Amino acid sequence: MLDINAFLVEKGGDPEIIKASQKKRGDSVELVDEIIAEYKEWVKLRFDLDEHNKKLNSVQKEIGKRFKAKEDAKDLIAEKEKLSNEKKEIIEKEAEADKNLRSKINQVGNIVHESVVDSQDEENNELVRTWTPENYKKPEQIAAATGAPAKLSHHEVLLRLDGYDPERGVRIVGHRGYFLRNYGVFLNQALINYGLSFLSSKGYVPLQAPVMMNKEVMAKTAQLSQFDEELYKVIDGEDEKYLIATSEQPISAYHAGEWFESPAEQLPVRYAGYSSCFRREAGAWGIFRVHAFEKIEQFVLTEPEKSWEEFDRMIGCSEEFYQSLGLPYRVVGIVSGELNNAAAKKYDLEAWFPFQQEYKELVSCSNCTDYQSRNLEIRCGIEKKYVHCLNSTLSATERTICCILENYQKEDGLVIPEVLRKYIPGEPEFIPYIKELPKN
Amino acid sequence: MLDINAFLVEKGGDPEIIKASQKKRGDSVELVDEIIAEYKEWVKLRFDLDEHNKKLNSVQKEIGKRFKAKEDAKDLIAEKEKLSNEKKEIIEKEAEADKNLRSKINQVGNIVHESVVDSQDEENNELVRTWTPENYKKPEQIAAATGAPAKLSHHEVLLRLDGYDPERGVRIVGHRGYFLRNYGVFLNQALINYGLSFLSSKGYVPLQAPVMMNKEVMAKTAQLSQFDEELYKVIDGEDEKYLIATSEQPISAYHAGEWFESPAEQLPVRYAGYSSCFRREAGAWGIFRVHAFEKIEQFVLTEPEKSWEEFDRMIGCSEEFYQSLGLPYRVVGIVSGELNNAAAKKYDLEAWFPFQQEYKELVSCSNCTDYQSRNLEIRCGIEKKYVHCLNSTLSATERTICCILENYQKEDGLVIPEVLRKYIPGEPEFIPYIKELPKN
Ligand SMILES: Nc1ncnc2c1ncn2[C@@H]1O[C@H](COP(=O)(O)OP(=O)(O)OP(=O)(O)O)[C@@H](O)[C@H]1O
Numbered sequence A, B: 001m002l003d004i005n006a007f008l009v010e011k012g013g014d015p016e017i018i019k020a021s022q023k024k025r026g027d028s029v030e031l032v033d034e035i036i037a038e039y040k041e042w043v044k045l046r047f048d049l050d051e052h053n054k055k056l057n058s059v060q061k062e063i064g065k066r067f068k069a070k071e072d073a074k075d076l077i078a079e080k081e082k083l084s085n086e087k088k089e090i091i092e093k094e095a096e097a098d099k100n101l102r103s104k105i106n107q108v109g110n111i112v113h114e115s116v117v118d119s120q121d122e123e124n125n126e127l128v129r130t131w132t133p134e135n136y137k138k139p140e141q142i143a144a145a146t147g148a149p150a151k152l153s154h155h156e157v158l159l160r161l162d163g164y165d166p167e168r169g170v171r172i173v174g175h176r177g178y179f180l181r182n183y184g185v186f187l188n189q190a191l192i193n194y195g196l197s198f199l200s201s202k203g204y205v206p207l208q209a210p211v212m213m214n215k216e217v218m219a220k221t222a223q224l225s226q227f228d229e230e231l232y233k234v235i236d237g238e239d240e241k242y243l244i245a246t247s248e249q250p251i252s253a254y255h256a257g258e259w260f261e262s263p264a265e266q267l268p269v270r271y272a273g274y275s276s277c278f279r280r281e282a283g284a285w286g287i288f289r290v291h292a293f294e295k296i297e298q299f300v301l302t303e304p305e306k307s308w309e310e311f312d313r314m315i316g317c318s319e320e321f322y323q324s325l326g327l328p329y330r331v332v333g334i335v336s337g338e339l340n341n342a343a344a345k346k347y348d349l350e351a352w353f354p355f356q357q358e359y360k361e362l363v364s365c366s367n368c369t370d371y372q373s374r375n376l377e378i379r380c381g382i383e384k385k386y387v388h389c390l391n392s393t394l395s396a397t398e399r400t401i402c403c404i405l406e407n408y409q410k411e412d413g414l415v416i417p418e419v420l421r422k423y424i425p426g427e428p429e430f431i432p433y434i435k436e437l438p439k440n
């Protein structure tokens, strides 16, 4: 969440910037004034509590003097108990005020960076840049790597290669369940390992996250809307955990409660996160939008003064990555009304799917400034100063496979993207269609 | 489960072999006579039901004749309703008899193969064979690949390499939670990919299983004892699934309801299963016994007449695999009293851990004959004949890493097992200790 002081003009805050940000988000603006009011009540309680402390101390010292003089203290004792019963109420109320104030500040989204388009309609997404392999004229229904007609959808290509099994997958696990088979397995591992190797050559530290999280730690890194809709709950006898939606959740908590006291030399810290990811929400056919999948994720901690530069570095890496796979794409600046609570700025890389004949999102890159690190108490250098946290998909591997399948197809099978060959037993340059489709 | 006919002498069965098997297992023997009795009640109900069918038909035809002659039928109608009310009770009872009989047969373990030692004490495990790399004198506290003193435990080696993080893992996920870091990540992927490549060169089909299963399909492949103790339940809004304990569960269901009608040409089918695995039960320090981990699993379907030969083939593969990693091991024949319900025979490969100074299980290999395929209706050729199912771990990768860490350690770091090098960015032959331990 934002700092409490950001709401308070008297403590150097700017409640107006916050109201403007809420408006760009399409979220509640009255929430800011509510918070400011609650803050004053809470301060009143702090003062009253504090004055009660001092009055009790006094009335204690007078009661001691009277017991010294061997004099009755029935009147002082009565006042001591009056003050004390009050201190009790006050204590109970201050705690409830603190509790509600924190819950309210928790609903306020991060400050939307000025560079972001003010809009609730994705039509207005900034078109940041576009990229094409040089042997590919323009985005159309042509598979970019082969020049061949993008005749088959990713689901169709995968099936002809005998690379996956949705039919047996659904019978066994339900909606969108699947097995990967043969080269479907090798392509998936190829991406995981190429992704790890790629990021690691850029100084990222490979980091395999666990895929369950304690409820309480999850709650500090993901918004209220996520649990009761997106996350699988896991039953552990009597305990509950969540399956993670992305390794960004557990990896963001990695340095919770730590302190980069010498930021210049210690930061930035860069992680090449790898894990499976689980989503309750996933709806066509194929492995494009499914309930379980693997993701190589970029996660970075930087000094506050360096995050925007890092943000550019990060999207740069994902671009360099898709270029290396020869996949055309565009980068778009997500409109304010579509940012999640933690993001001050978000870019998506959407790669071209030539059969679908549209750009579809493969990568999402966000500067979350100190919104999560504040919660997680991840401090930075020498009111309190936290690190900034950025996260950017490197590759959601099953979805990246889909894009590959459509762009690497040709009449008789699939060209294997050059960079992935060394990761595949036999380093094949090409694999043939094994199966005919029913349709035709 | 076993065939119902296996309990019935009159239908060619051998209830005595079954009682003997239950005794070797240490499970209930009276259960066999119970089943035989229930079977007779059920047959009585079938006959009564059948006789009621015929009597109703008759009384129907007499009632029609009377309505033709325009004669009163108050006496026949009364008998029709008597017979009919009875047919109702009978129907309700036959269903309940069928239900209980099936539940009872479901508790009876597979027939323990004669070659298995009859005993409830693992002390009596058959010592099948032993193997040592030739440069390694004998199993002792010496790291087998380097000749160096096995001075550090796997947990200690991993930590000095900065290859994992149990401390941050526990904070985030709880008991035994961990991240893999750096080379810990690369070693894990190295094993997954080497395992896939190894099995695939032997004609196994790589197959990545999903890690959730519908309750109902899980129940057909795993015993009663497993759910209410070993398996994580997953909450999907209102639905429930399980996280799998091993890819053998979903892969065994892969061909549920199918029919290998030309077994000679169609079988055997061999799968190199890969998935993560989740276990509620996991307890020292380290990644040896944890709640989540990866496993390359061998799964094979064969004709009944070929399973024992295949069984030897399968354990042969895991042995060849550990030999290639240079890890000393022994193969042991698990005593009857320790077989799970589905196994007729089980071999474990236990690799030498030179710091622990003991053999610890890395691989488990079981011929389950047709015990599961009967449930899953996986038929074989031209009373009903099913395929046999065998499963054998190729590598539980985190645990295999532990064995490697202890055997590949030396004074200043870890030798990287030769076969894994090509799977690791930079193909290092050696990696240095990065961290000192507190202890010393
Ligand atoms: N259900 C899914 N199945 C497969 N891959 C997915 C799924 N959901 C997301 N991904 C992959 O993860 C990447 C980012 O997903 P995530 O939800 O973290 O991004 P986001 O910030 O929510 O972006 P958006 O809101 O546009 O989805 C996507 O580019 C996509 O490739």
Ligand SMILES: Nc1ncnc2c1ncn2[C@@H]1O[C@H](COP(=O)(O)OP(=O)(O)OP(=O)(O)O)[C@@H](O)[C@H]1O
Residues within 6 Å of the ligand: B246, B279, B281, B282, B287, B288, B289, B290, B291, B293, B348, B361, B362, B363, B364, B393, B396, B398, B399, B400
């Ligand atoms: N909790 C765990 N953490 C890590 N690896 C495990 C765990 N449990 C099992 N394994 C690995 O899986 C392999 C087989 O485990 P599984 O439970 O399927 O075998 P099993 O037939 O039950 O043998 P046993 O009863 O001796 O454990 C083992 O050899 C071990 O390497």
